[PDB]
């Protein structure tokens, strides 16, 4: 089995906003906006809810970009990151507990501080392609294995 995880990336013309993930898992990395979804509410609602929660952000409409299966040696599940993206969004993206907002201009992605497998799917979220991902982790920084390709279908 998996577990459902979403994540969702502003990304308009000239730039991305990213978080500062400032507790619990990955601590310490820019990131998109996302985490588990619940028990009682759709990938895409739990997609909205996070963002909302992280950022104070709330969208029109998300679209579905990808997904990408992670495996972390010697733990049992797998997880089922959902990925979306926005382009327009409504409110002011202010800090929360968890995550400090900033736009990057998107040939200033901070990717030395960010997830290693951002390097890969990076750039065909950019170029507005649709992909699935998988990515064999030992620990938080060595990448074991990995896939990707561009999809038809999300
Ligand atoms: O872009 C990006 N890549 C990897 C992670 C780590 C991760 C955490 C929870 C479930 C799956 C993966 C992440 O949070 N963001």
Redesign the pocket.
Same mark, same amino acid.
């Given at each position: 089995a998996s @577990?459902l995880?979403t994540?969702v990336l502003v990304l308009q013309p000239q730039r991305v906003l990213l978080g500062m993930?400032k507790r619990g /898992? $990955?601590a310490g @990395?820019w990131? $998109?906006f $996302? $985490?588990?979804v619940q028990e009682g509410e759709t990938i895409e609602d739990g997609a909205r809810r996070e963002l909302q929660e992280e950022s104070g952000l709330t969208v029109d409409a998300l679209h579905k970009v990808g997904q990408?299966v992670?495996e972390?040696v010697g733990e049992p599940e797998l997880?089922?990151?959902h990925?979306f993206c926005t382009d327009s969004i409504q409110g002011t993206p202010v800090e929360s507990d968890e995550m400090r907002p900033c736009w990057f201009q998107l040939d200033q992605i901070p990717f030395k501080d960010?997830?290693?497998?951002?390097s890969y799917? /990076?750039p065909l979220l950019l170029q507005k392609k649709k992909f699935h991902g998988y990515?064999k /982790?030992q620990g938080?920084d060595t990448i074991l294995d990995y896939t990707l390709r561009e999809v038809d279908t999300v």
């Open positions: @577990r995880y994540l993930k /898992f $990955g @990395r990131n $998109g $996302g $985490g588990k990408i992670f972390f997880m089922d990151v990925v960010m997830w290693p497998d951002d799917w /990076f990515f /982790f938080q």
